[PDB]
Amino acid sequence: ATPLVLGENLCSINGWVPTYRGEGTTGKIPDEQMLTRQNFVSCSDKECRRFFVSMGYVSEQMNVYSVKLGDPPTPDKLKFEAVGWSASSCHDGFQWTVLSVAGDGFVSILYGGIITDTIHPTNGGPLRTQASSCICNDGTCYTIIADGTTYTASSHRLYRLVNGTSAGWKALDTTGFNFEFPTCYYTSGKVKCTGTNLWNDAKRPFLEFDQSFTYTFKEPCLGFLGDTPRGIDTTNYCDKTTTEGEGGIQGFMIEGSNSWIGRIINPGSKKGFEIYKFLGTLFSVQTVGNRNYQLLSNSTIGRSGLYQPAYESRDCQELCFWIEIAATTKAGLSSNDLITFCGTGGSMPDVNWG
Amino acid sequence: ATPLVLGENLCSINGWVPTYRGEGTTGKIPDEQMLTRQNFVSCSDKECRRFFVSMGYGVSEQMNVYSVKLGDPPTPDKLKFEAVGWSASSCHDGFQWTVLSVAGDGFVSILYGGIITDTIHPTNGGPLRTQASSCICNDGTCYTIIADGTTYTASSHRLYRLVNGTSAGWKALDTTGFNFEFPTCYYTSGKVKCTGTNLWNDAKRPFLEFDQSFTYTFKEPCLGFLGDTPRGIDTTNYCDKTTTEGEGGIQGFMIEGSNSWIGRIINPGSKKGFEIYKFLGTLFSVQTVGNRNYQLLSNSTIGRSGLYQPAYESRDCQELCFWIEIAATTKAGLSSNDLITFCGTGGSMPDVNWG
Amino acid sequence: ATPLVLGENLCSINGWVPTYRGEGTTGKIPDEQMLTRQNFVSCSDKECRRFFVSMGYVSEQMNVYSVKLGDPPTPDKLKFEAVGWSASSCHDGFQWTVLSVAGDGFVSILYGGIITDTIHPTNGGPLRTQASSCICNDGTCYTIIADGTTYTASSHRLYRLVNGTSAGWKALDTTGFNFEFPTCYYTSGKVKCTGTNLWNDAKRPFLEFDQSFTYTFKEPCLGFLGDTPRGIDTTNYCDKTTTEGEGGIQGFMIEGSNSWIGRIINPGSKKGFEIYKFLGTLFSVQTVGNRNYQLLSNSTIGRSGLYQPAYESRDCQELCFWIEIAATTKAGLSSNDLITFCGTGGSMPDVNWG
Amino acid sequence: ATPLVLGENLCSINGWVPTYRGEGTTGKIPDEQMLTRQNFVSCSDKECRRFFVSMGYVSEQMNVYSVKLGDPPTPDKLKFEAVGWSASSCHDGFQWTVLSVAGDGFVSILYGGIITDTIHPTNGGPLRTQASSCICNDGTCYTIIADGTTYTASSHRLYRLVNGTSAGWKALDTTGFNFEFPTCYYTSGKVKCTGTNLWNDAKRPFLEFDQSFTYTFKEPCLGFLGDTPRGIDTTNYCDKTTTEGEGGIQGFMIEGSNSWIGRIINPGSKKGFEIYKFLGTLFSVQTVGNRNYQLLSNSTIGRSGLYQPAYESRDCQELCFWIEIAATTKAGLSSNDLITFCGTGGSMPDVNWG
Ligand SMILES: *[C@@H]1O[C@H](CO[C@@H]2O[C@@H](C)[C@@H](O)[C@@H](O)[C@@H]2O)[C@@H](O[C@@H]2O[C@H](CO)[C@@H](O[C@@H]3O[C@H](CO)[C@@H](O)[C@H](O[C@H]4O[C@H](CO)[C@@H](O)[C@H](O)[C@@H]4O)[C@@H]3O)[C@H](O)[C@H]2NC(C)=O)[C@H](O)[C@H]1NC(C)=O
Ligand SMILES: *[C@@H]1O[C@H](CO)[C@@H](O[C@@H]2O[C@H](CO)[C@@H](O[C@@H]3O[C@H](CO)[C@@H](O)[C@H](O)[C@@H]3O)[C@H](O)[C@H]2NC(C)=O)[C@H](O)[C@H]1NC(C)=O
Ligand SMILES: *[C@@H]1O[C@H](CO)[C@@H](O[C@@H]2O[C@H](CO)[C@@H](O[C@@H]3O[C@H](CO)[C@@H](O)[C@H](O)[C@@H]3O)[C@H](O)[C@H]2NC(C)=O)[C@H](O)[C@H]1NC(C)=O
Ligand SMILES: *[C@@H]1O[C@H](CO)[C@@H](O[C@@H]2O[C@H](CO)[C@@H](O)[C@H](O)[C@H]2NC(C)=O)[C@H](O)[C@H]1NC(C)=O
Ligand SMILES: *[C@@H]1O[C@H](CO)[C@@H](O[C@@H]2O[C@H](CO)[C@@H](O)[C@H](O)[C@H]2NC(C)=O)[C@H](O)[C@H]1NC(C)=O
Ligand SMILES: *[C@@H]1O[C@H](CO)[C@@H](O[C@@H]2O[C@H](CO)[C@@H](O)[C@H](O)[C@H]2NC(C)=O)[C@H](O)[C@H]1NC(C)=O
Ligand SMILES: [Ca+2]
Ligand SMILES: [Ca+2]
Ligand SMILES: [Ca+2]
Ligand SMILES: [Ca+2]
């Protein structure tokens, strides 16, 4: 048993390939499955797991469960993770760390299935996890937690975790903006994170940091707006797009030699998902845009987020993402499911997946 | 490939958070689950397991001992068959699971791995009774307590030491004047410490501590915060039995430490809610105080409760947890049990309901 | 991996404990379970397994299956083992060796699930396995196969196997008698086996041999008749009681410090099962008869055999036995299931298990 | 821990014995079980596995799964592999490589369950995997992919895979024929494949190649026609039998000291499977043909393919095959399942295995 360590260099990405299309490909989800909520994917040294929150088939009776990515959320296949309605998890090579918001809005850290730490609100609660995979590398896990009673006065903290106990935190300067649900990936000695501004920005705030918690917030300079809601696409500039900048939904950008922005196509009817390659940094006006894949056209789209398969010693680090989709049960209840794409260096055709 | 060894020093505890919460705590248990009873938790050096005795399905497969990995539902797919019996205790020494199971007319079979390695028989009439809880293993040897006698008014109890599934000798315990059923135990500071249940003449709970040389002393809590159910009104502090409503009782625990705890059922009438009270100092002085009463559960109907220590740690202190058995109902309407578990936090918690 | 290797010394046995009781020990088999016949138990170095033959819920349709001892034979819990109507198995530390009679009556030998040898009838056919766990020790496996068109003129061969392959064999002088379904065990450098005489004996014959094939048949000098059917019990004499010596059923004896013989108590209706202790060998006439255990009463019983749980490091080799019981399904179909008992050094109360 | 490396020399084969026989061969299929299609068998260093494509209990709702050979395709024994309707797989000693076709018809390579590469058509698609085990030896894996919109103008490529990454491919000259669904085996420094010609040949095209991609297409010189459909068997000649050469179904030949050709007995009602021994090469007009085994009699037959077990210290390389058969579930939906045969050194009696 050895610490999970990710790749220093990303695989080159030129397109995306489905690795899972959830139980609603038939149009409807089987009623024996749990009503699933706040879905995200995280990977260990041996598998990828689907984590979500559920009650049955904010409440005192929501739990965090996981199944193996690809297994359907039936009673047989469920693993109880924690009590809570907001969760983040990640694996370090030894054990799952699961961060969960429960009770009056504090977070409990479970390692294996043992409480290793709790964290309590300080700016008025409730605490909010990043609702996405956290990042473990070489024995340490990193995560981001939000406090504050309004998005207009939110506070954000960067946590480092060792075997599930807090090894410290750092206040992030988020003056002038809001930074919810950061979804992250590791590369070249940095964790890089895309968050959601529910207050004043139709673009997404960006964050990178290293293990010394030296950090930088960045604003994407591209008029292709990532948030939903949002207005008309703008010319390229380096500061915030404030128009329709209130509200928002979890989503991601990828910054690399090729950069990407994934977004909901129609902000009004939350229908369709597109992801768009750019030749260069998200943070220059001069960068151009090379290819836009319409991955979904007909499904209604909720949250989306990044994940890194890690069971590897390979020459190149793979990158994936999940999308939470509005679904309907056979009986006719509203629910979600979850689809996943993974990167490829191969240039892909135009295929609509749903 | 090494003997399980527990921390000599317990972590500080000032609060409790759930680690597992069965579906029946917040609604109906799914019908595909095995109906469980006599639940308890025991941990190895790799995982925590939920041991239990089955009652079948929605009228089917009963009478046996099973385990699942704690966190997993008792669906057919997740069941490890363990032994034949209606009553079991288990423990793990680093090598294999030891399982004490009562069967037949009340003899105890001992299984190490799945291998029968010993058998224990009643002197004083039977039927024999396990502690219905985890046994304690440390550094190769495992300890457990077994009850004999036909009435709670004439109960005998024995301390058993076990190596690799075989009996490495035993001591008769002096329980003259009280009853000591279903002890739940923990290890710290060189002693095994157990909390028993007196179904005869005490509404407080009897206490035991002992080392590997079978040097024991039984203690009696000097606290008027009455641990058993049933029970009467809370009393003044005094250092002997509360005989009033001391007949009957349910398995439950006390924690003795720098900080002490008593967990009990809140309404002894309708068996509703569970509380755990922190005490500053020992359970065995009349001066020790009373600091914070946590009302962990309110909604649900409580039964047995027990202690367990996880030991797949690489932690600098020994963690302590407890399990609470809950009366619940299946989707079909059959009544059944499951489980909530709690482990200690070093920091104080808010007043919150967990079930 | 490493080779499976047993204890040279048997644990003392003064009593018997049930390790597993089927659904049809306790009344009626559910209809979703397979219809097992030819049940027996063989152990590996990690688990004991229940092997049987089934056909649905001599035929081409017959297959060999197995489950983990304890698991019910629901389709979900089944492992296909071979095609056949007769089977012996055993584990060498590396792989399950499985002998199966199939086709016209040749035995196929599977190692893993790959065929490593075939054995064909010379003396008439069809061939017949020992219907019971064969024995493996130190990388090498031993079994006994029978040929002959009738039990009068039956031939018996002793096979040595390594990794699934015939490593030579030996003919056994069974002039005089018949040696069907030997059920065996190992100690003291010898493999001791108990056969069923369907010809001229209502006692059970007895084999022992070493790894270098030196063997001797012995006759129990004992008037406690083990085979079924049988006559009234007799005084002790060292010759075959030929009285209702025709007919027969699979069963065992144990030779040791204490020695045992189990049998169906009533050969009329085949109800109840008893097992009886003796203070010394079965092959002296002078040997007493101590405690008799009435393990089963109201149940109509059938085949029984031996197995040695082989996953130790130990001061003693455990020894067990299975009993095959007639049973009924919820729709009223006739079928079987299985109960097991293991030894324990101490004496046991008089308990009736069904 | 180490690369899987196969045996340079085949076992002597003079007969076949079943090692798995599905429940639907000998009756109806339990409806708990998944509805398998495109079944085939691939082996690792530890086990043989049954791969297939299913929907539930060019279709976009399909996925690739697998179970261990011998277990049933019940939910508990299931394993998700990939999205897609067409799959090939092989193990290298480290990880499963799985080739899957999805979307409009590109292929994805998964290694572990991690996406490691894609492959794209340039001749119009969809792409088609060999629908059978691909071949790994000494760390590198080989597989063959088909492209093109008619079989009249089909196109084929031979890929070299290393840890799930493409290390190159070579065009195969299939001028004047079609080469679908090759099913292959390894010996004597060569990979040998039997294909299916849907265009202009009732015999089966054959292909051998070495690790440096030197290859030779051969036509079998035997008038015992391998494909279905086909016409009247003819005389031995060394080129295509064009009549009834349109259409076809996946199947195999074996080239050895003893050669074999397995085929469906009745081309019209696809019932019965036979396999014919030839004393020598499939590629001389002179070679003769000795023993014909009628293996299956009752069953309706479809696809058939080769696989080689590698969990072994045999002294000689074993060869097996699987046959997909039409079947019905208890509730009477059409499905398939599987019978597998492995080679034995001895000659065998004429038994009906299904
Ligand atoms: C302990 O029990 C309390 C209270 O018990 C409640 O009353 C008892 C007398 C008994 O009848 C119980 O069955 C009953 O639950 C539980 O606290 C309740 O928790 C539920 C669910 O979280 C809350 O129900 C919600 O009420 C909202 C407005 O008051 C309403 O907006 C919600 O609707 C939403 O969800 C429903 C599905 O349930 C959906 O249909 C709607 O469309 C919408 O999404 C919902 O109905 C109660 O408010 C709570 N009651 C009180 C007084 O606190 C508690 O959960 C339980 N604890 C545990 C851990 O089991
Ligand atoms: C977080 O958890 C990990 C996993 O338990 C801890 O890593 C472990 O650290 C200990 C201390 O070095 C190691 O134990 C020692 O291992 C060496 C060599 O194997 C041996 O010589 C010693 O006798 C001792 O057993 C252990 O190997 C290592 N875990 C592994 C397998 O990598 C880590 O210490 C924890 N971190 C903190 C701060 O609690
Ligand atoms: C039956 O199968 C078993 C398992 O495959 C065979 O046992 C194997 O024997 C070979 C040679 O005797 C062993 O190889 C050697 O291993 C030792 C270390 O133990 C190493 O020092 C040598 O360099 C060499 O590699 C092999 O380990 C062993 N397998 C195991 C797991 O024990 C056996 O030979 C087979 N029977 C026959 C006679 O074919
Ligand atoms: C209980 O079982 C364990 C494991 O089988 C035994 O530990 C082994 O003891 C032997 C004999 O001294 C050593 O050779 C091994 O190295 C030990 N194994 C390990 C992993 O420690 C132990 O001896 C047994 N205890 C008794 C008293 O029987
Ligand atoms: C393909 O995968 C194997 C397995 O990971 C690689 O073999 C490893 O090679 C490195 C470098 O020498 C060693 O550190 C590992 O110990 C090897 N693994 C094992 C278990 O043998 C192999 O190098 C890979 N090939 C390429 C080029 O990717
Ligand atoms: C192939 O078909 C025949 C005909 O149905 C099967 O033969 C029957 O088998 C059963 C049980 O073995 C017998 O009771 C019948 O008497 C047989 N009928 C005939 C006409 O032979 C045969 O079993 C089938 N083979 C397989 C393996 O499915
Ligand atoms: Ca916004
Ligand atoms: Ca009491
Ligand atoms: Ca006889
Ligand atoms: Ca053709």
Author numbering:
A (entry chain A), C (entry chain D), D (entry chain B): 82 to 138, 149 to 152, 156 to 170, 170A, 171 to 196, 200 to 307, 309 to 330, 333 to 337, ...
B (entry chain C): 82 to 139, 149 to 152, 156 to 170, 170A, 171 to 196, 200 to 307, 309 to 330, 333 to 337, ...
Sentences from the paper on this structure:
The extensive sequence divergence of A/bat/Peru/10 NAL from the recently characterized N10 prompted us to determine its X-ray structure in two crystal forms at 2.68 Å and 3.0 Å. The N11 NAL forms a typical “box-shaped” tetramer, containing six four-stranded, antiparallel β-sheets in a propeller-like arrangement. Comparison of the A/bat/Peru/10 NAL monomer with other NA structures reveals surprising similarity despite low sequence identity (29.6%). In addition, a calcium required for stabilization of all known influenza A and B NA active sites is conserved in N11 NAL. Among the eight conserved charged and polar residues that interact with substrate in all other influenza A and B subtypes, only Arg118, Arg224, Glu276 are conserved (N2 numbering) as in N10 NALs. Arg292 and Arg371, critical for sialic acid binding, are replaced in A/bat/Peru/10 NAL by Thr and Lys, respectively. Furthermore, only three of eleven second-shell residues are conserved in N11 NAL (Trp178, Ser179 and Glu425). The N11 NAL active site pocket is much wider than other flu A and B NAs, including 1918 N1, due mainly to 150- and 430-loop movements. The glycerol moiety of a canonical sialic acid, as observed in other flu A and B NA structures, would clash with the N11 NAL active site. N11 NAL catalyzes extremely low levels of sialic acid cleavage as observed for N10 NAL, and similar to H18 HA, N11 NAL exhibited no binding to 610 diverse natural glycans including sialosides in a glycan microarray assay.
We have characterized a new influenza virus from a flat-faced fruit bat (Artibeus planirostris) in the Amazon River basin in northern Peru. While our phylogenetic analysis indicated that the Peruvian bat virus shares common ancestry with recently identified Guatemalan H17N10 bat viruses, their genetic and phylogenetic divergence is such that we propose that their HA and NA genes be designated as new subtypes H18 and N11, respectively. The influenza HA and NA proteins are critical for interaction with the host and determining the subtype of influenza type A viruses. We determined crystal structures of the A/bat/Peru/10 HA and NAL proteins expressed in a baculovirus system.
